[PDB]
Amino acid sequence: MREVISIHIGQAGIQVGNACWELYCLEHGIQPDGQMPSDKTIGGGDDAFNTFFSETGAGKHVPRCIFLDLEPTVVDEVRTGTYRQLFHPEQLISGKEDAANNFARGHYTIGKEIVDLALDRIRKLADNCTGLQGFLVFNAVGGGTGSGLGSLLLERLSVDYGKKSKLGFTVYPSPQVSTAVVEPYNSVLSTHSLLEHTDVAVMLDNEAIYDICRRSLDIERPTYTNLNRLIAQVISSLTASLRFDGALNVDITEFQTNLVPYPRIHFMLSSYAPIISAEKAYHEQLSVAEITNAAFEPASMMVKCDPRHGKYMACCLMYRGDVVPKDVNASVATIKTKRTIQFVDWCPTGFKCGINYQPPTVVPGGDLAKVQRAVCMISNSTAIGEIFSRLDHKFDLMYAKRAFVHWYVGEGMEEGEFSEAREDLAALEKDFEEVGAE
Amino acid sequence: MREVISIHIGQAGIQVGNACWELYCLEHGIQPDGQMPDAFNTFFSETGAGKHVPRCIFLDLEPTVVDEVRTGTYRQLFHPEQLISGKEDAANNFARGHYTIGKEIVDLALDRIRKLADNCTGLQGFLVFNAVGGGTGSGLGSLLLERLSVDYGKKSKLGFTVYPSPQVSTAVVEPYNSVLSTHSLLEHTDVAVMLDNEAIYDICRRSLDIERPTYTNLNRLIAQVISSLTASLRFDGALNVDITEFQTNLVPYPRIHFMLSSYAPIISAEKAYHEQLSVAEITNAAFEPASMMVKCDPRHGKYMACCLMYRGDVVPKDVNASVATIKTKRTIQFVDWCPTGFKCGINYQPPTVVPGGDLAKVQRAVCMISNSTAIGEIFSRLDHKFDLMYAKRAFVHWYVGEGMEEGEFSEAREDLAALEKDFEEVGAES
Amino acid sequence: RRQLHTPGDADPAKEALLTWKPEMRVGQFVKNGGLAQENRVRGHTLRATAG
Amino acid sequence: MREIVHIQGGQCGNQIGAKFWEVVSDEHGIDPTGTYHGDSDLQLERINVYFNEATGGRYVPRAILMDLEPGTMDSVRSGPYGQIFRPDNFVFGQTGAGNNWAKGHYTEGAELIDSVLDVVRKEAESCDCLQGFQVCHSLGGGTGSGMGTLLISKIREEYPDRMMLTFSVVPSPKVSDTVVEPYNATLSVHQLVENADECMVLDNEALYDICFRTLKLTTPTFGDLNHLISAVMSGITCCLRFPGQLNADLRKLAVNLIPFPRLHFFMVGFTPLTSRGSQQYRALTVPELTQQMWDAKNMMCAADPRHGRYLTASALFRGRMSTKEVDEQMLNVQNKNSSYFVEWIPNNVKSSVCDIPPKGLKMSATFIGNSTAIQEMFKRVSEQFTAMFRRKAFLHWYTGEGMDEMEFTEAESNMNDLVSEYQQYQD
Amino acid sequence: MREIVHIQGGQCGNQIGAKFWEVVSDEHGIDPTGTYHGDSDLQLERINVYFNEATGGRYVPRAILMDLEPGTMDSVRSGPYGQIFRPDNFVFGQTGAGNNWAKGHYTEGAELIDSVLDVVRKEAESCDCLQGFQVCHSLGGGTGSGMGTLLISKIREEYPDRMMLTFSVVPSPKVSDTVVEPYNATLSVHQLVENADECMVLDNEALYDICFRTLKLTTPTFGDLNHLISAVMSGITCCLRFPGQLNADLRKLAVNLIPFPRLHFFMVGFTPLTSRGSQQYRALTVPELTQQMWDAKNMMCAADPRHGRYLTASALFRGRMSTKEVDEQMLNVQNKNSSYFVEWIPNNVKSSVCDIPPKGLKMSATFIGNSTAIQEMFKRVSEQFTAMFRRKAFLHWYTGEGMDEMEFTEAESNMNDLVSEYQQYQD
């Protein structure tokens, strides 16, 4: 059976979770109170597979998700918002005080008390489902709750749930547009745990989605709401092959064997090809060969890196809508004959193509327009070594004479734990260089 | 014909029975005045023409709680002389309720037990309700259980008692009264089911999410446990588990008969629609340690034997399929010499909801009563508190002056001292 | 004792067991463009068990 | 001129036989009231085997319903086809064994064994020539096991030249309904090895596996598990109640399937089981009956027939069929896999023909097998019995009724002796 | 009296077979239910080859559907001609191989390869005389490759004298769909060499050339590729199902094609492929069919027949033709192009004529060609493997389920020997 459990840690996890579950409800037609309409439920009451909802009694659906965060004032907005009656009230997990941008607090002092209550609902969701394919993790490594509780929770699911995939969509500190001072400290310590625990990690960067909104959407005034509504469009298009069928279905377990060549190398870029506003969508001809070219453009990448600097290891193409399975094949031949992009010499077949038969559902009040086709591009590149090397440079600057260390040292952690994550990131840096070497 | 006689001793006994009989009258359709507008004969006697009386006695030396029943909404339900009262209570003294003031009322109680036993054709067992923290719950409970064993030999004595919590306790001399109660309850009570206030305190906090519950909210779901135990007699099912079924299926050794209690679905009104209640989930929830009605960690102990009472829409595979999953679970542990350990019962009647109560309407429910080696942790805490106060003879002149001799404290301590040695002996792997 | 209906007899396929009726048929259902699949009262446990 | 007296013991035996008389009276044409409405002449010609003539054309079963609690008796009478039984035959106690085997055998069963032997005698000399006695009970309970073997021991001393059919549901490996299954079963099998003449071994989880994997019923209760047993029940005695090309009565099944007097435990299985949606795809002809009949998934016991060699087997075929095709089919299955059949007995399978098929089918079969694979279900009860008896757990209830530990050791030795000789024939 | 058991594996195998059973059922007149409704009496003469007779006149196919992902079992029965298949034959897993050859062959096979053998053993026993087995799968994925070859390994040890038709698609030169496709093919072809008695080579991008240029479909459906494959899979067995002037079973096709045991990989073409805009103007004659037969682009393989000589070829003609016209046309293509045929084998082309053409065409022909030109395809798969294996990329997954790097090195041992053994006859 096909089913995933989504977990959302930190402030960025909940806000993405609010946008994603808004998209999932409109995908399946679930009303905000939690009831499918009476005309839809006239069929068989059995629900043999639903990767995001579980049938409860008669006509009631609850999401297979938990909202854990140490700060209560962000999950209470979900608890008082328009989706109050959808989520199970025990699934929303609050806390007394936030980690406050501290990996030490989220992992040792205050994250240890709430992680046992979080695992209780994970077990209560594990036995309720039959075929578990993976855990979807949403957090930002810049924050204390995303880094500290994210490292502690992913460590427990590794021991408790062996060999289960754990696909983590994480937000990393931007080179320029970043909101916190201790983001280099929290991101470096996060990669010490995210390297070996998560199965596949898809990189998301804050200002790269800002640049997409300014250029493609011509929204001169973007906020976090506008960013998450198309971050959610990435997640739904990534998992659309489970919920709906197509010519070439691609499961979550089909990602791992086709995208990561080495166990340590599992950080991925992300791209969404047609991102067009309302007034531009009618005149533009959104063809399969047109959007496939746009997916591999450096501007459409959601991580602020230049793919021309690196080399593509493997690429995954998530096609949605009315796509015949040869214009995707005609597009790959045009993409692979181009010399501006670079595929590595030891990977002759680099493309993983998947097709779904449903167009993306447009969120009402959203910024995206209704498009017949969509390409969600997930690629493995050696250009991601540029992202971790910059965070390595910023972390070494402040650690040179030990700034912002008494906060981390006092709340449980020791001095030497900073150097271990620095060495783990540095050893990961040369791992990306040696795999790109011919 | 099946019948069962329930007695209630002490402040906790009357209040629990005030909550048990309001649930019993609701299940059978009995109105508060006592008139129904074949299954009621287990607890109610057919009296005259279209009128029923409970097969119960409310005895207590403290007349205030008994007079509350006399002036309450169930004045027309109970026979007036089963509401036995006393002049003044034992007042947190085991020696008072067992030697001096207990003797003047135990003869009247035994006489009315005989009049109830003569009315019933086939008696299966006696239900006792008491708290060992008090005087008459300990003293008069010890005296009545001693006399009822001699008067009715080889009849089951089903014990429903409340022990003091390690943390939450409302009196000082409760460890003194508890230890002397265990000496009498060891050999006279056939089967003892433990209850702890602080564990049932936590269940209403976590599961029923009410942050100010009182004694009424506990006793309302105490009655859910008691009704689920004896629902096999009142209502039909695929697998009936009678009272005499419950003795030999749960008690391996004569001196080991204390047991833990658990009721699986503890769900509020708003929590009911969201949660998908099925047999697998409640069987998981029944074995969850925070759902236990006695404050102990079953992970520390060993499950000696378990009993399951399934009430409502339960098919016989789902109880069997869930037990296979519970037996393969590793965080719980069964003892090595008991490979066949699970006793299951299915009753077709769903549980009823009281108006103004907190529990929501559920299609299926599980009451889990099991024997465990973790019960010795309760006795160790009560022994440690008793040994601390008895170290230099505090709160002893009240007991010594009122009939009891000094050495009676020592022999009751030795009874519990050997009781701890038996749990670790039976729990040791061989 | 009070007589109660056995709850397990609500299944339509169990209304006549051990009889050879070849014309009994199985329905299917579709969930908003999802995979069309067999309709039983509890088909999930027959398909992929539980746990 | 041959007839069978039916005895039902315990909650299981009362419930199993209630569905047994549901399918037999429907097969012989008796309505729920008690009269006869069948449209076939062959139904009424042999009805004295299970029914007694009454005034006005009423037919009453030869069923002695015996237990220790009045709750199970009222449920049987309240259900459909429960009013055909004789109210005088409803013998019962008042207290109940509570699944204490010593209580049903010595303490409580003693003052009822005179009452139940009074009425099984009344059924005995009322009729002409007894073919045997059929009893259905459990081995894990105490009402149908402790008192049931008490009846069988007394009814064998009274009538020692008659057949004895026992349909005993045995304790299960994976799941348990009580806690004292190894104590009751080892005591009951010790009584059943000398007293009972031939035994049907049943087990609930194999009934559960049949109605889940094969029948594709996602929620079957005890109601249709007994229906599976009821078709087994009618398949054994189909030769008596209806004619056939090859007649094999209960004595002929006894002499063929029992090589040595302690080799009397068998497993059983009903042949034509197909899920409701797949009935159109499955053709109903003898070769596809034989492959399902010999399938390990079709055995209603916990024993897997692939582990042990078949000492002796038999097929109870019903319907319109050809003897020339069945004989070569039974020859072919002995030659396709000759390793699964014992060597020193040629022609291990004896097949019989009944021309009247059961209701709702044009062809059916019932399989009785004597294989040494039944040592698996016995030895695990013996393994569970030795686990608790060495610690004397749950024994003070049994020794308070007069049975000391000597009978527990004697039952243990006989149980180990029974599995000692099963393995001696597998080698 | 000759029958074929069909097994479909994976996403590709299930959809190919469903389109195969779409086509092969209509030409015998069986509707989606199973009832015969054809207008000719010769259709019912050989129904046994691909259908089992059931009660009520329903015909059920001899198809076994296997997969590790339960989504495809929704994909087969809910499409057209989806209700003919037996629900017992719907044997499937729960997790999906996920394009891993190790998961299909080592881990997830072991819980399912026992179950799929029980269906095949049941279907082979119900037959009277097996002509051979026919499987269709993919060499690109993991479900049809790892588990698909696992059944082929386990079915040759049970039935060693029966033929084995494999219709397997391979990785493509131009454009692909799965990244680890060279890994899955090299392991599967390593297994397919020794067990599969004959192999048919397919690839989607040769069919894309056929659909876009010969049939001139502007936007061909993904199932339109399957209809080219389905017409072939009916064409190989066309002489079995119907009478003909020259009888040629699967054995006569086998014994005439392979000169040596290891050269059992064939490349296949289908002759009468014309666009609908020019179907009026085309005259279907024997010179017309043969000219389209030997064309390089009409082949369903990426190997160009001009590069390597034709070692042995076979043609299966359907319709009303003249034996003299067919024989003199096959001698014409050998004499006109003698450099493209091997010298030490005279009379390379063995032709067969069947008098029942397919539906909608008065004349048709299916071409099978064993040539050394197919070594270009296997070397192209092998050169993709050695690029990835030399740095152990995408290898930690495959060694995760148990296999070592030694089995990867042995995969290129038989792959490079296969292309070298093809090479020694080209010169």
Ligand SMILES: Nc1nc2c(ncn2[C@@H]2O[C@H](COP(=O)(O)OP(=O)(O)OP(=O)(O)O)[C@@H](O)[C@H]2O)c(=O)[nH]1
């Ligand atoms: N895309 C997106 N990113 C967000 C959002 N909110 C916060 N972020 C990112 O998160 C960073 C701020 O730290 P957080 O991860 O939110 O802090 P936290 O996880 O709650 O940890 P604590 O604040 O210590 O509780 C910012 O730099 C943003 O990049 C959001 O709504 N959408």
Ligand SMILES: Nc1nc2c(ncn2[C@@H]2O[C@H](COP(=O)(O)OP(=O)(O)OP(=O)(O)O)[C@@H](O)[C@H]2O)c(=O)[nH]1
């Ligand atoms: N669950 C529950 N427990 C109670 C209730 N009332 C008293 N208790 C428990 O009983 C203990 C006091 O002992 P009791 O036996 O009730 O005292 P008593 O019955 O008044 O004894 P006397 O003073 O001699 O009359 C307290 O510590 C409580 O834990 C009640 O209404 N419900």
Ligand SMILES: Nc1nc2c(ncn2[C@@H]2O[C@H](COP(=O)(O)OP(=O)(O)O)[C@@H](O)[C@H]2O)c(=O)[nH]1
């Ligand atoms: N076949 C069948 N077995 C049953 C049924 N009800 C209970 N059982 C079995 O009987 C055993 C319990 O024995 P019990 O009924 O207490 O024996 P009793 O005391 O003699 O009636 C369980 O292990 C069940 O497997 C039923 O309806 N059908």
Ligand SMILES: Nc1nc2c(ncn2[C@@H]2O[C@H](COP(=O)(O)OP(=O)(O)O)[C@@H](O)[C@H]2O)c(=O)[nH]1
């Ligand atoms: N011709 C054809 N090719 C198919 C079909 N289905 C899948 N394929 C091809 O099979 C390849 C991948 O097969 P895959 O789904 O991974 O097989 P599996 O995972 O082992 O079951 C793709 O490149 C497709 O081109 C089909 O119906 N027809």
Ligand SMILES: [Mg+2]
């Ligand atoms: Mg925060």
Ligand SMILES: [Mg+2]
């Ligand atoms: Mg008081």
